[PDB]
């Protein structure tokens, strides 16, 4: 399985990815991914149990969630893998990502409604069913609530942080995980959600197919961080209330631990991932 930069997909790969996503939507499978994500983001709390977000397991949890989704896509078309969106590189609304042959563009100013691409409400192929308000159409406001996506220099500053995570293992932490997640520092992952706007800014953010491409790049940055810091590993490593320790299993699956997900190459490789070096 090779995960490729979205910017590099052929027209055939874009077609096949879109069709597979639309079939998971038609069959009812897609919406249950949105529902699972919303349940964890509404339940994960800084002072209590936290598994999907605001916690060290943010990265392995989303790695396994994306694996579940990719496997569902491959059950429809075995050639499809999740592409990733390097938002440090492809940082404008003119990016091919947002073209009508791929995800479609920004929403119109009146109501945020996306008007083009395969996921526009007018196609009849993308009802927003798992939602927090009456509106049933995909919405975006690219660059509306925050003006810029993270830059490569900002990403590199986060990648240079040596500790994976630190007590209190939540949104107040120092360390790589919370800086990548974005609750402290220059803010990588949370700011991208805010930049897309629409459902992507909400707990039901997998309603926008760009969710998967954003998280596939966050997941690639975890892999890059490991290559920069081969001496650093997941923490905590046992006996921490409310937090998933290294060898503890994770909900909702219950059968997989962070330890089983640290090495992505057991499941997929990237088009390019630099070797450890000085």
């Amino acid at each position: 399985t090779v995960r490729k930069n979205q910017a590099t997909l052929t027209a055939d790969e874009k077609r096949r990815f879109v069709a597979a996503v639309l079939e998971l939507k038609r069959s009812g499978r897609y919406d249950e991914f949105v529902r699972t994500h919303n349940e964890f983001i509404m339940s994960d709390t800084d002072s209590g149990e936290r598994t999907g977000h605001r916690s060290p397991s943010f990265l392995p949890w989303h790695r396994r969630f994306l694996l579940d989704f990719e496997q569902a896509l491959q059950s429809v078309d075995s050639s499809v893998t999740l592409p990733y969106w390097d938002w440090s590189a492809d940082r404008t609304v003119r990016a091919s990502l947002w073209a009508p042959d791929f995800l479609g563009g920004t929403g119109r100013s009146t109501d945020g409604r996306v008007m083009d691409g395969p996921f526009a409400a007018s196609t009849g192929n993308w009802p927003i069913n798992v939602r927090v308000d009456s509106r049933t159409y995909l919405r975006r406001s690219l660059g509306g609530s925050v003006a810029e996506l993270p830059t490569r220099a900002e990403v590199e500053s986060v990648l240079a942080i040596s500790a994976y995570d630190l007590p209190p293992y939540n949104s107040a932490s120092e360390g790589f995980r919370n800086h990548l997640e974005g609750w402290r520092g220059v803010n990588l992952h949370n700011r991208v959600h805010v930049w897309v706007g629409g459902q992507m800014a909400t707990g039901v953010s997998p309603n926008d197919p760009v969710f998967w491409l954003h998280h596939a790049y966050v997941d690639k940055l975890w892999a890059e961080w490991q290559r920069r810091h081969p001496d650093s590993a997941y923490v905590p490593t046992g006996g921490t209330p409310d937090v998933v320790d290294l060898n503890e299993t994770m909900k909702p699956w219950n059968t997989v631990r962070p330890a089983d997900l640290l090495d992505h190459t057991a499941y997929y490789t990237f088009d390019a991932l630099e070797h450890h070096h000085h």
């Binding site: 983001i41 339940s43 994960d44 800084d46 209590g48 109501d111 509106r135 949104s171 949370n190 800014a201």
Partner: protein
Amino acid sequence: AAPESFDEVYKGRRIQGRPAHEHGGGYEVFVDGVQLHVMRNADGSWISVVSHYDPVPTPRAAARAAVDELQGAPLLPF
């Protein structure tokens, strides 16, 4: 100690807050009488389910951000 309650009409909609599949909130917010899930972060900031990745300083600020996001739409209960 929880924030104070509030009640106002913001952009034509009634927003209310009070101390009290989702976490066990110590504070409740309503938009036109429909509960809006909100959450407090460790640093004292707030988010809501319609603006989950963008902390704001207070539960009233989260309610106002939700009204701005909804653009007139009724909220659906969680």
